Design an enzyme around this catalytic site. Structure first.
Site, PDB file in Angstrom:
ATOM      1  N   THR A  22       0.763  -1.225   0.000  1.00 17.44           N
ATOM      2  CA  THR A  22       0.000   0.000   0.000  1.00 17.44           C
ATOM      3  C   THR A  22       0.822   1.320   0.000  1.00 17.44           C
TER       4      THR A  22
ATOM      5  N   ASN B 143       6.060  -2.141   3.827  1.00 16.53           N
ATOM      6  CA  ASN B 143       5.063  -1.832   4.865  1.00 16.53           C
ATOM      7  C   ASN B 143       5.669  -1.848   6.273  1.00 16.53           C
TER       8      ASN B 143
ATOM      9  N   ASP C 175      -9.453  -4.024  -0.663  1.00 22.22           N
ATOM     10  CA  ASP C 175      -8.344  -4.740  -0.018  1.00 22.22           C
ATOM     11  C   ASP C 175      -8.697  -5.386   1.332  1.00 22.22           C
TER      12      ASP C 175
ATOM     13  N   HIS D 157      -8.298  -9.507   1.873  1.00 18.31           N
ATOM     14  CA  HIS D 157      -7.460 -10.271   2.757  1.00 18.31           C
ATOM     15  C   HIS D 157      -8.213 -11.425   3.442  1.00 18.31           C
TER      16      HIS D 157
ATOM     17  N   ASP E 219      -3.890   0.828  -5.836  1.00 12.74           N
ATOM     18  CA  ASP E 219      -2.478   0.752  -5.461  1.00 12.74           C
ATOM     19  C   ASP E 219      -1.844  -0.611  -5.909  1.00 12.74           C
ATOM     20  N   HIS E 220      -2.622  -1.700  -5.866  1.00 14.83           N
ATOM     21  CA  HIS E 220      -2.124  -3.082  -6.183  1.00 14.83           C
ATOM     22  C   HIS E 220      -3.341  -3.973  -6.318  1.00 14.83           C
TER      23      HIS E 220
ATOM     24  N   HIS F 201      -0.964  -9.644  -0.947  1.00 18.35           N
ATOM     25  CA  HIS F 201      -0.356  -9.027  -2.108  1.00 18.35           C
ATOM     26  C   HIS F 201       1.015  -8.627  -1.652  1.00 18.35           C
TER      27      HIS F 201
ATOM     28  N   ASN G 190      27.450  -0.059  -8.119  1.00 15.31           N
ATOM     29  CA  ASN G 190      26.832   0.476  -6.906  1.00 15.31           C
ATOM     30  C   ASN G 190      25.286   0.330  -6.951  1.00 15.31           C
TER      31      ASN G 190
ATOM     32  N   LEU H  58      22.048   3.278 -12.553  1.00 18.11           N
ATOM     33  CA  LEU H  58      22.629   4.279 -13.402  1.00 18.11           C
ATOM     34  C   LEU H  58      24.014   3.840 -13.844  1.00 18.11           C
TER      35      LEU H  58
HETATM   36  C1  LIG Z   1      14.706   8.080 -10.116  1.00 14.99           C
HETATM   37  O1  LIG Z   1      14.504   9.531 -10.052  1.00 14.99           O
HETATM   38  C2  LIG Z   1      15.279  10.119  -9.021  1.00 14.99           C
HETATM   39  C3  LIG Z   1      15.001  11.616  -8.916  1.00 14.99           C
HETATM   40  O2  LIG Z   1      15.506  12.189 -10.115  1.00 14.99           O
HETATM   41  C4  LIG Z   1      16.787   9.877  -9.240  1.00 14.99           C
HETATM   42  O3  LIG Z   1      17.356  10.137  -7.981  1.00 14.99           O
HETATM   43  C5  LIG Z   1      18.288  11.213  -7.951  1.00 14.99           C
HETATM   44  O4  LIG Z   1      19.536  10.782  -8.463  1.00 14.99           O
HETATM   45  C6  LIG Z   1      20.684  11.628  -8.319  1.00 14.99           C
HETATM   46  C7  LIG Z   1      21.971  10.802  -8.551  1.00 14.99           C
HETATM   47  O5  LIG Z   1      22.065   9.712  -7.628  1.00 14.99           O
HETATM   48  C8  LIG Z   1      20.771  12.307  -6.940  1.00 14.99           C
HETATM   49  O6  LIG Z   1      21.706  13.375  -7.000  1.00 14.99           O
HETATM   50  C9  LIG Z   1      22.491  13.463  -5.767  1.00 14.99           C
HETATM   51  O7  LIG Z   1      21.933  14.403  -4.857  1.00 14.99           O
HETATM   52  C10 LIG Z   1      22.632  14.612  -3.639  1.00 14.99           C
HETATM   53  C11 LIG Z   1      21.827  15.601  -2.809  1.00 14.99           C
HETATM   54  O8  LIG Z   1      20.707  14.850  -2.418  1.00 14.99           O
HETATM   55  C12 LIG Z   1      19.794  15.556  -1.552  1.00 14.99           C
HETATM   56  O9  LIG Z   1      18.966  16.526  -2.199  1.00 14.99           O
HETATM   57  C13 LIG Z   1      17.985  16.007  -3.108  1.00 14.99           C
HETATM   58  C14 LIG Z   1      17.258  17.138  -3.852  1.00 14.99           C
HETATM   59  O10 LIG Z   1      16.399  17.897  -3.016  1.00 14.99           O
HETATM   60  C15 LIG Z   1      17.047  15.042  -2.355  1.00 14.99           C
HETATM   61  O11 LIG Z   1      16.020  14.559  -3.199  1.00 14.99           O
HETATM   62  C16 LIG Z   1      17.860  13.892  -1.732  1.00 14.99           C
HETATM   63  O12 LIG Z   1      17.010  12.991  -1.035  1.00 14.99           O
HETATM   64  C17 LIG Z   1      17.574  11.660  -0.886  1.00 14.99           C
HETATM   65  O13 LIG Z   1      18.240  11.404   0.352  1.00 14.99           O
HETATM   66  C18 LIG Z   1      17.440  11.295   1.538  1.00 14.99           C
HETATM   67  C19 LIG Z   1      18.245  10.538   2.582  1.00 14.99           C
HETATM   68  O14 LIG Z   1      19.361  11.340   2.870  1.00 14.99           O
HETATM   69  C20 LIG Z   1      16.077  10.589   1.398  1.00 14.99           C
HETATM   70  O15 LIG Z   1      15.174  11.043   2.393  1.00 14.99           O
HETATM   71  C21 LIG Z   1      15.436  10.714   0.009  1.00 14.99           C
HETATM   72  O16 LIG Z   1      14.449   9.704  -0.101  1.00 14.99           O
HETATM   73  C22 LIG Z   1      16.504  10.576  -1.086  1.00 14.99           C
HETATM   74  O17 LIG Z   1      17.118   9.299  -0.941  1.00 14.99           O
HETATM   75  C23 LIG Z   1      17.509   8.651  -2.171  1.00 14.99           C
HETATM   76  O18 LIG Z   1      18.619   9.264  -2.843  1.00 14.99           O
HETATM   77  C24 LIG Z   1      19.923   9.162  -2.254  1.00 14.99           C
HETATM   78  C25 LIG Z   1      20.991   9.818  -3.155  1.00 14.99           C
HETATM   79  O19 LIG Z   1      20.924  11.236  -3.114  1.00 14.99           O
HETATM   80  C26 LIG Z   1      20.263   7.693  -1.940  1.00 14.99           C
HETATM   81  O20 LIG Z   1      21.449   7.649  -1.173  1.00 14.99           O
HETATM   82  C27 LIG Z   1      19.120   6.970  -1.200  1.00 14.99           C
HETATM   83  O21 LIG Z   1      19.352   5.582  -1.142  1.00 14.99           O
HETATM   84  C28 LIG Z   1      17.742   7.173  -1.835  1.00 14.99           C
HETATM   85  O22 LIG Z   1      17.615   6.357  -2.981  1.00 14.99           O
HETATM   86  C29 LIG Z   1      18.953  14.491  -0.823  1.00 14.99           C
HETATM   87  O23 LIG Z   1      18.379  15.038   0.350  1.00 14.99           O
HETATM   88  C30 LIG Z   1      24.044  15.122  -3.901  1.00 14.99           C
HETATM   89  O24 LIG Z   1      24.705  15.222  -2.667  1.00 14.99           O
HETATM   90  C31 LIG Z   1      24.804  14.182  -4.848  1.00 14.99           C
HETATM   91  O25 LIG Z   1      26.030  14.812  -5.228  1.00 14.99           O
HETATM   92  C32 LIG Z   1      27.224  13.981  -5.098  1.00 14.99           C
HETATM   93  O26 LIG Z   1      27.483  13.116  -6.213  1.00 14.99           O
HETATM   94  C33 LIG Z   1      27.871  13.864  -7.380  1.00 14.99           C
HETATM   95  C34 LIG Z   1      27.784  13.123  -8.721  1.00 14.99           C
HETATM   96  O27 LIG Z   1      27.726  14.101  -9.752  1.00 14.99           O
HETATM   97  C35 LIG Z   1      29.220  14.546  -7.138  1.00 14.99           C
HETATM   98  O28 LIG Z   1      29.779  15.109  -8.301  1.00 14.99           O
HETATM   99  C36 LIG Z   1      28.907  15.624  -6.109  1.00 14.99           C
HETATM  100  O29 LIG Z   1      30.071  16.379  -5.863  1.00 14.99           O
HETATM  101  C37 LIG Z   1      28.451  14.892  -4.843  1.00 14.99           C
HETATM  102  O30 LIG Z   1      29.553  14.098  -4.466  1.00 14.99           O
HETATM  103  C38 LIG Z   1      29.945  14.317  -3.103  1.00 14.99           C
HETATM  104  O31 LIG Z   1      29.205  13.447  -2.253  1.00 14.99           O
HETATM  105  C39 LIG Z   1      29.451  12.075  -2.532  1.00 14.99           C
HETATM  106  C40 LIG Z   1      28.370  11.170  -1.926  1.00 14.99           C
HETATM  107  O32 LIG Z   1      28.105  11.533  -0.586  1.00 14.99           O
HETATM  108  C41 LIG Z   1      30.897  11.776  -2.109  1.00 14.99           C
HETATM  109  O33 LIG Z   1      31.228  10.408  -2.241  1.00 14.99           O
HETATM  110  C42 LIG Z   1      31.856  12.616  -2.969  1.00 14.99           C
HETATM  111  O34 LIG Z   1      33.181  12.390  -2.534  1.00 14.99           O
HETATM  112  C43 LIG Z   1      31.480  14.121  -3.009  1.00 14.99           C
HETATM  113  O35 LIG Z   1      32.038  14.877  -1.941  1.00 14.99           O
HETATM  114  C44 LIG Z   1      23.949  13.816  -6.089  1.00 14.99           C
HETATM  115  O36 LIG Z   1      23.909  14.864  -7.043  1.00 14.99           O
HETATM  116  C45 LIG Z   1      19.404  12.781  -6.413  1.00 14.99           C
HETATM  117  O37 LIG Z   1      19.489  13.193  -5.059  1.00 14.99           O
HETATM  118  C46 LIG Z   1      18.374  11.653  -6.482  1.00 14.99           C
HETATM  119  N1  LIG Z   1      17.091  12.149  -5.981  1.00 14.99           N
HETATM  120  C47 LIG Z   1      16.218  11.406  -5.306  1.00 14.99           C
HETATM  121  C48 LIG Z   1      14.927  12.066  -4.870  1.00 14.99           C
HETATM  122  O38 LIG Z   1      16.439  10.218  -5.045  1.00 14.99           O
HETATM  123  C49 LIG Z   1      17.084   8.407  -9.524  1.00 14.99           C
HETATM  124  O39 LIG Z   1      18.432   8.257  -9.916  1.00 14.99           O
HETATM  125  C50 LIG Z   1      16.139   7.808 -10.562  1.00 14.99           C
HETATM  126  N2  LIG Z   1      16.379   6.373 -10.707  1.00 14.99           N
HETATM  127  C51 LIG Z   1      16.708   5.827 -11.890  1.00 14.99           C
HETATM  128  C52 LIG Z   1      16.946   4.344 -11.969  1.00 14.99           C
HETATM  129  O40 LIG Z   1      16.799   6.491 -12.927  1.00 14.99           O
HETATM  130 CA   LIG Z   2      -3.150  -1.456  -0.506  1.00 18.43          CA
HETATM  131 CA   LIG Z   3      25.812   2.753 -11.076  1.00 18.33          CA
HETATM  132 CL   LIG Z   4       7.097  -5.163   3.499  1.00 17.61          CL
HETATM  133 ZN   LIG Z   5      -3.686  -5.266   1.739  1.00 14.58          ZN
END
Ligand SMILES: *[C@@H]1O[C@H](CO)[C@@H](O[C@@H]2O[C@H](CO)[C@@H](O[C@@H]3O[C@H](CO[C@H]4O[C@H](CO)[C@@H](O)[C@H](O[C@H]5O[C@H](CO)[C@@H](O)[C@H](O)[C@@H]5O[C@H]5O[C@H](CO)[C@@H](O)[C@H](O)[C@@H]5O)[C@@H]4O)[C@@H](O)[C@H](O[C@H]4O[C@H](CO)[C@@H](O)[C@H](O)[C@@H]4O[C@H]4O[C@H](CO)[C@@H](O)[C@H](O)[C@@H]4O)[C@@H]3O)[C@H](O)[C@H]2NC(C)=O)[C@H](O)[C@H]1NC(C)=O
Ligand SMILES: [Ca+2]
Ligand SMILES: [Ca+2]
Ligand SMILES: [Cl-]
Ligand SMILES: [Zn+2]
Ligand SMILES: Cc1cc(OCc2cc[nH]n2)c(C(C)(C)C)cc1Cl
Ligand code: NA
Ligand code: NA
Length: 805
Positions: free
Chosen positions: A159, A180, A261, A265, A308-309, A420, A685, A689
């Site tokens: 959900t 969940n 849903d 169940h 949702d599902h 589900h 990683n 990507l």
């Molecule tokens: C699906 O769509 C989504 C959305 O477009 C795609 O996800 C994006 O991908 C980008 C690349 O991975 C990523 O960009 C990074 O952003 C970092 C800043 O992030 C913060 O701000 C954003 C924007 O407001 C915000 O959305 C982020 O929120 C995440 O993190 C919190 C937890 O802290 C969560 O609450 C939230 O759910 C979300 O989590 C998810 O994303 C993170 C990655 O950001 C994962 O770790 C989680 O598992 C989870 O999936 C953040 O609050 C920014 O810091 C990064 O910049 C670094 O890397 C670049 C590369 O160019 C480097 O050049 C920079 O200098 C910098 O490097 C430095 O930091 C490194 C790492 O710490 C370090 O090793 C180096 O040495 C450097 O010093 C980066 O630009 C973007 O944030 C996410 N957005 C979201 C919402 O997820 C996704 O890829 C798509 N999927 C597919 C398959 O296509």
């Molecule tokens: Ca549901």
């Molecule tokens: Ca990769």
């Molecule tokens: Cl679950």
């Molecule tokens: Zn259910």
């Protein structure tokens, strides 16, 4: 602390939220124990029920009543939804013929058609046909609006992961609601359905629709409904908000129903008890539509009916127990049910070993109803790995089954008949989409699509710019009458080199050998023209892929195939070839079994070398264009070029060789020619990507040849299969895969048998969208076709599921 002695007078279901300890009258107050003393009295009136009756018409207003039938109710916006029908001789919306809504027909002061998302929990896709006789309002929405045969949920098919994906356009791994139940090791906190921690804001990532709206000047109704607010009250509240003054009225709304849903169940997806919940949902839709018609909004509002599902048959006796496989069962924490997630019970325990856990759970019983995986080895189409809340060890559970840790967990909790959560390709998990209103098309069916796509569409319906998300904006343009989003192809970042003959054989010291020095002016000009790209229009059907990052690469032409060869990764990024229906499979001749030939267009320094493969006892090599499919004995030499070679484990070669020797020709026969594009993927990683070179964790021993984590193929033909793939006039057909490059076949329990018994099954499991491959390679396909770009976007998001109808 709540100071619950403030008042809800006139503040019922306030859209904005007041800071504690001022008591709350917002929906959500119930969940926090924060409602004002008079909430139930003022905001949850129930007196006299939900419908007008003949005697109530024109009555004197009584502020105690749940809804009203007095003359002033329309301008107060608080009539019972059946008011006009009972008191003014109107017809129910469902009894009116449908008529095309060519333009929005809205009251003065609406700046835009409002959107109402009507979400129904556990509403399986086949209920639309199977329950059609008892859902006439939903059936009218469906037949008169735009509908898909089903909508694909995200994994896991639970959900909150799905509702939050609808709200954000993001995979659960990116929005953070990955199940969940969840443990976040950085916070060291847990998330459960019951209770309060789930309302903490740090669980919820990305940017949901209501925030996207608010940031851009569009007002939003609240999306979450407390379970104790009845459905009638939820509808009446939405209808009240729609009567607000222009400056206060929201433009986006959601209704949610816990049915079907909740009953699903208890009774299973098609239990006889399921008819009544479907009736009641339909009645609620009827109430919304009658209410909209009374307000003159039934040809103004866009309505989205979405689940949702779905729901599957699952009972207690179909439970696999980890205690039947593991001796250490008390050293692990299992998240159980329709998926499994395993971690160590304690981080102080250095004994605990994931490797031996996996091995103890792999192919141990003949009909084993779950399969263990390291998360990074899960099919890429699930996008279920890149989050610290997802445990390294995952169990994919067969449809109809549960996994639990010990038998005592199951009978100290048979209660249920449905559940589900399974793989989102499973038919029983599919849900519904219907769009109805001035912005949707009239009486139109669209193909099935993934729910990650809807956020973009809802932004389009509202004139909002969507936050970055995982939808492919434009791929759902064919749902819409207007407000389409007209995307452009991304620009190529790196232009190729087109090398000619620049190196002499003897400059190469790669340790490669070929039996090939066997020596005409006719076919001398012939071979040169092939190397210059004479056959390219046959093998590159849709243009060359664009490289959307900075890199150094060469286009290489050949009689049977064209490739984009990376000087950085020392192999092709892509290899393109067409196999006609008529094409012949030949074998690799004996004198060529271990032949690898230097490519005189490409420097020794940008080439792989055979010595490394000889030295690497684990690693062998394969070819991207298969020698088996060469057009002539002489063209076959091209297939042994060092620039066509890629690193492959011997176990993976069994897979790859069967795909290339048997399956490609089968597909060409069945599809009337196919165009194939194959290549490597590097996702060390597991973020879905493309990796940069400095992210690569494994090389062929003693070399700079990087080892792919996966190999892809994109297989394209004519949708009208009476036309051959290379002479196609209209729409295309595609299927793709992303196969994990693994040193063993442990994933396939029947792999000791002939490949004809397991390979294709493995490939189906790892089916993929072209768009998945684009993310993973930084390439952009189908750049030069005769089709519209939105149509190609839809093609790139297509997933061939290999489920029956
Ligand atoms: C699906 O769509 C989504 C959305 O477009 C795609 O996800 C994006 O991908 C980008 C690349 O991975 C990523 O960009 C990074 O952003 C970092 C800043 O992030 C913060 O701000 C954003 C924007 O407001 C915000 O959305 C982020 O929120 C995440 O993190 C919190 C937890 O802290 C969560 O609450 C939230 O759910 C979300 O989590 C998810 O994303 C993170 C990655 O950001 C994962 O770790 C989680 O598992 C989870 O999936 C953040 O609050 C920014 O810091 C990064 O910049 C670094 O890397 C670049 C590369 O160019 C480097 O050049 C920079 O200098 C910098 O490097 C430095 O930091 C490194 C790492 O710490 C370090 O090793 C180096 O040495 C450097 O010093 C980066 O630009 C973007 O944030 C996410 N957005 C979201 C919402 O997820 C996704 O890829 C798509 N999927 C597919 C398959 O296509
Ligand atoms: Ca549901
Ligand atoms: Ca990769
Ligand atoms: Cl679950
Ligand atoms: Zn259910
Ligand atoms: C349509 C819709 C409904 C919804 O919640 C409804 C609900 C669930 C339990 N109670 N109420 C949500 C969240 C759950 C994200 C808030 C999003 C969306 Cl997109
Ligand atoms: Na080897
Ligand atoms: Na096996």
């Amino acid at each position: 602390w709540t100071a619950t002695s403030g008042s809800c007078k006139g503040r019922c279901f306030e859209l904005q939220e007041v800071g504690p300890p001022d008591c709350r009258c917002d929906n959500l107050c119930k969940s926090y124990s924060s409602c004002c003393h008079d909430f139930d009295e003022l905001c949850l009136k129930t007196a006299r029920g939900w419908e007008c009756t003949k005697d109530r018409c024109g009555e004197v207003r009584n502020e105690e009543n749940a809804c009203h039938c007095s003359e002033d109710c329309l301008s107060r916006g608080d009539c019972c939804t059946n008011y006009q029908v009972v008191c003014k001789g109107e017809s129910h919306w469902v009894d009116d013929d449908c008529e095309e809504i060519k333009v929005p027909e809205c009251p003065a002061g609406f700046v835009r058609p409002p959107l109402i998302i009507f979400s129904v929990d556990g509403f399986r896709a086949s209920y639309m046909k199977k329950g059609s006789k008892v859902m006439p309002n939903i059936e009218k929405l469906r037949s008169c609006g735009t509908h898909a045969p089903y909508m694909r949920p995200v994994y896991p098919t639970k959900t909150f992961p799905n509702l939050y994906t609808l709200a954000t356009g993001l995979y659960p791994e990116s929005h953070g609601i990955v199940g969940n139940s969840m443990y976040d090791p950085v916070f060291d906190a847990s998330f459960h359905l019951r209770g309060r921690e789930k309302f903490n804001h740090r669980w919820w990532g990305g940017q949901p629709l209501w925030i996207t709206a608010t940031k851009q000047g569009v007002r939003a109704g609240t999306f979450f409904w407390s379970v104790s607010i009845p459905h009638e009250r939820r509808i009446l509240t939405i209808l009240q908000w729609l009567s607000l003054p222009d400056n206060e009225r929201p433009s986006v709304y959601a209704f949610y129903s816990e049915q079907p849903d909740f009953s699903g169940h208890k009774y299973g997806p098609f239990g006889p008890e399921m008819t009544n919940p479907l009736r009641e949902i339909d009645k609620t839709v009827g109430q919304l539509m009658d209410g909209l018609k009374q307000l003159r909004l039934h040809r103004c509002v866009n309505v989205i009916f979405v689940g949702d599902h779905g729901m599957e048959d699952v009972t207690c006796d179909r439970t696999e127990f980890l205690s039947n496989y593991l001796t250490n069962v008390d050293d692990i924490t299992l998240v159980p049910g329709t998926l499994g997630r395993i971690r160590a019970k304690s981080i102080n325990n250095s004994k605990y070993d994931p490797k031996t856990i996996i091995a103890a759970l792999t192919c141990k019983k003949p009909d084993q109803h779950f399969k263990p995986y390291m998360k990074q080895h899960l099919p890429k189409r699930l996008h279920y790995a890149n989050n610290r809340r997802i445990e390294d060890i995952h169990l994919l559970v067969d449809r109809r089954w549960h996994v639990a840790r010990k038998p005592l967990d199951v009978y100290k909790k048979c209660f249920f008949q449905g559940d589900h959560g399974f793989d989102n390709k499973v038919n029983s998990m599919q849900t519904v989409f219907v769009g109805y209103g001035p912005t949707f098309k009239y009486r139109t069916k669209v193909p099935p699509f993934e729910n990650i796509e809807l956020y973009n569409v809802m932004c389009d319906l509202l004139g909002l710019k969507p936050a970055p998300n995982n939808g492919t904006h434009g791929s759902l343009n064919h749902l819409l009458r207007t407000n389409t989003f007209r995307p452009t192809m991304p620009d190529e970042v790196s232009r190729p080199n087109y090398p000619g003959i620049m190196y002499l054989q003897s400059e190469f010291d790669l340790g490669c050998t070929c039996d090939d020095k066997v020596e005409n002016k006719l076919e001398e000009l012939n071979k040169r023209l092939h190397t210059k790209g004479s056959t390219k229009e046959r093998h590159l059907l849709y243009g060359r892929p664009a490289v959307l990052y900075r890199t150094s690469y060469d286009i290489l032409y050949h009689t049977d195939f064209e490739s984009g060869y990376s000087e950085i990764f020392l192999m092709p990024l892509w290899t393109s070839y067409t196999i006609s229906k008529q094409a012949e499979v030949s074998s690799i001749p004996e004198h060529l079994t271990n032949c690898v030939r230097p490519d005189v267009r490409v420097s020794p320094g940008f080439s792989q070398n055979c010595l490394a493969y000889k030295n690497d006892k684990q690693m062998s090599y394969g070819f991207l264009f298969p020698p088996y499919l060469s057009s002539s004995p002489e063209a076959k030499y091209d297939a042994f070029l060092v620039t066509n070679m890629v690193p492959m484990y011997p176990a993976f070669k069994r897979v790859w060789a069967y795909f290339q020797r048997v399956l490609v020709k089968k597909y060409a026969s069945e599809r009337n020619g196919v165009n194939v594009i194959s290549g490597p993927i590097f996702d060390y990683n597991y973020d879905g990507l493309r990796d940069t070179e400095d992210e690569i964790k494994q090389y062929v021993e003693g070399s700079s040849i990087p080892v792919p984590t996966h190999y892809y193929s994109i297989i394209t033909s004519c949708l009208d299969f009476t036309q051959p793939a290379d002479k196609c006039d209209g729409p295309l057909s595609v299927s793709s895969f992303i196969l994990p490059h693994r040193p063993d076949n442990d994933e396939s329990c029947n792999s000791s048998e002939d490949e004809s018994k397991w390979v294709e099954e493995l490939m189906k499991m790892h089916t993929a969208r072209v768009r998945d491959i684009e993310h993973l390679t930084g390439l952009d396909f189908y750049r030069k076709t005769s089709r519209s770009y939105s149509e190609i976007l839809t093609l790139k998001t297509y997933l061939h599921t290999y489920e029956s109808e």
